[PDB]
């Protein structure tokens, strides 16, 4: 999501002659994402091809994917370079998967990508494989030792048990992933020598994915300070259960309750406080002083006392947080950067217009008819202080 959302890195990774999946978690519409593919295909040199990643998590995205898949359908009906589709966070049911495989863009899909997290999820994909035996299906088996979206399932035991049934389908391409930064450590899974430690006879793999080790890369959009942070983090051997920051890494749960692997060394303030607040919420009112100050430490600022705070302080706080002085929102608008906050600028307007709405005793003729003009209002907007 953060890493591959940039059209620059996924292009550069592909231009290096490598397979990559464009992130869909950073694209909220067909149009905004169609810009990325267009930026991709422009930065895509002749013939080179890439794939796309999608999430199963929420209904709104799955309804957006109906427009998204038809976008992918339209793109490839137009002959777009994107040669694959990646379903994430869950395995679609047979009728849902058949649809994806059999789409008008099917040949341009050329294979389908699934990411099973459990034994049952693996067995589900096997049934998707037997569905269309002539359709290539790349099964990426991840761990919970991996980054981001998490799981309680071991790296080995899952693949150790399900491998035999996975190889009874020729259309299944087995790909092991997670906790791999190097060719040396990942060489044994390729030779099949990795299963020998568990006594099982050799168990070779068809491919390997690297999520984490590519984050510190040059063409990645990761900030200079964030890269240095990922670097100095020391790594670990097989994941341990004991709750702590483990080798600069501690798990944490998202808003939905699912675990997320985040960096607890580079940033120790957000994760641990979150675990404090989460486990502490009954009595929050009692610890309010301790809790409200810690939000300010991680820069999740509450506002100074709500009543007593002057309307300036309100309106000056939004400008403070929304408008960066270094990036110069006015100068940020000119390149037409995707980082543009314009909803935040629109947010501040609705607050400004509310301020006029609150204090005006008269008919509201002079004030409202001015700031609402395009040419006039937009000029007023690029200069927040004025």
């Amino acid at each position: 999501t953060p890493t591959t959302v940039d059209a620059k890195i996924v292009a550069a990774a592909a231009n290096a002659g490598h397979w990559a999946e464009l992130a869909g978690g950073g694209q909220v519409t067909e149009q905004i994402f169609n810009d990325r593919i267009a930026e991709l295909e422009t930065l895509l040199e002749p013939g080179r091809a890439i794939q796309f990643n999608t999430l199963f998590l929420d209904p709104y995205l799955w309804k957006l994917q109906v427009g998204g898949k038809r976008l992918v359908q339209r793109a490839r009906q137009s002959g777009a370079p994107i040669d694959g589709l990646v379903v994430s966070a869950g395995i679609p049911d047979l009728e849902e998967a058949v649809d994806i495989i059999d789409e008008l863009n099917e040949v341009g899909i050329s294979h389908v990508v699934f990411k099973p997290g459990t034994v049952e999820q693996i067995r589900s994909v096997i049934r998707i494989a037997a569905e269309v035996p002539t359709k290539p299906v790349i099964v990426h088996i991840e761990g919970g030792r991996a980054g981001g979206h998490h799981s309680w399932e071991d790296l080995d035991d899952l693949l150790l048990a399900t491998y035999s049934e996975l190889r009874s389908r020729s259309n299944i391409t087995i790909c092991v992933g997670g906790g791999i930064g190097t060719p040396e450590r990942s060489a044994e899974y390729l030779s099949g020598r990795w299963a020998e430690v568990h006594g099982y006879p050799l168990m070779p793999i068809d491919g390997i994915l690297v999520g984490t080790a590519a984050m510190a890369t040059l063409e990645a959009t990761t900030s200079p300070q964030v890269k240095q942070l990922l670097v100095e983090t020391k790594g670990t051997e097989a994941w341990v259960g004991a709750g702590k920051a483990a080798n600069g890494m501690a798990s944490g749960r998202s808003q939905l309750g699912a675990d997320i692997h985040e960096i607890d060394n580079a940033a120790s303030r957000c994760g641990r406080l979150l675990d404090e607040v989460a486990g502490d919420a009954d009595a929050v009112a009692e610890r309010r002083d301790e809790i409200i100050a810690a939000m300010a430490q991680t820069a999740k600022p509450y506002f100074g006392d709500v009543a007593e705070m002057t309307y300036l302080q309100w309106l000056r706080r939004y400008v403070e947080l929304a408008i960066g002085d270094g990036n110069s929102t006015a100068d940020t608008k000119r390149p037409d950067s995707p980082w543009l906050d314009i909803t935040w600028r629109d947010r501040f307007e609705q607050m400004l217009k509310r301020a006029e709405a609150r204090l005006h005793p008269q008919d509201f003729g002079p004030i409202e008819t001015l700031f609402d003009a395009d040419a006039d209002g937009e000029r007023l907007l690029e200069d927040p202080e004025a």
Binding site: A49, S78, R145, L218, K300
Partner: protein
């Protein structure tokens, strides 16, 4: 309010990076040392050292490795036609017509099999393939005359 949309601050932000949720994995972090190392370098580093390990023991300076530095191939012109499912026209990608030419053809003909230069694959759909000017592969389809 806390956890929502926390993934974007790691990229292009001047703020203190110790306040941000940034996502590694636990064990993969050990393999992360070099900073601002180009994607092309990391991915090749994987492939190049995987090749060497495979080369040294089993292959021992294989014909495949030697053929590469000397430019020799697998899947020549005749195979490439029957291999790649995608047929490019300009910047657009199309399915290989041979897939629908090979089997569905009533009369299909492969001329001079073992000889590569003279190799020709023709069909009753009136579509024929041959090589011209070295690397250029010539597919010739016809309607009536």
């Amino acid at each position: 309010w806390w956890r929502s949309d926390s993934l974007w601050q790691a990229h292009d932000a001047r703020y203190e990076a110790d306040q941000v949720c940034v996502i590694p994995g636990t064990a993969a972090v050990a393999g992360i040392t070099r900073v601002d190392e180009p994607v092309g370098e990391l991915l090749d580093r994987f492939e190049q050292a995987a090749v060497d390990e495979v080369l040294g023991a089993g292959a021992x300076x294989x014909x495949x490795x030697x053929x590469x530095x000397x430019x020799x191939x697998x899947x020549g012109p005749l195979a490439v036609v029957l291999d790649a499912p995608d047929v490019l026209w300009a910047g657009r990608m199309s399915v290989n017509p041979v897939h629908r030419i090979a089997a569905p053809x009533x009369x299909x003909x492969x001329x001079x099999x073992x000889x590569x230069x003279x190799x020709x694959x023709x069909x009753x759909x009136x579509x024929x393939x041959x090589x011209x000017x070295x690397x250029x592969x010539x597919x010739x389809x016809x309607x009536x005359x």
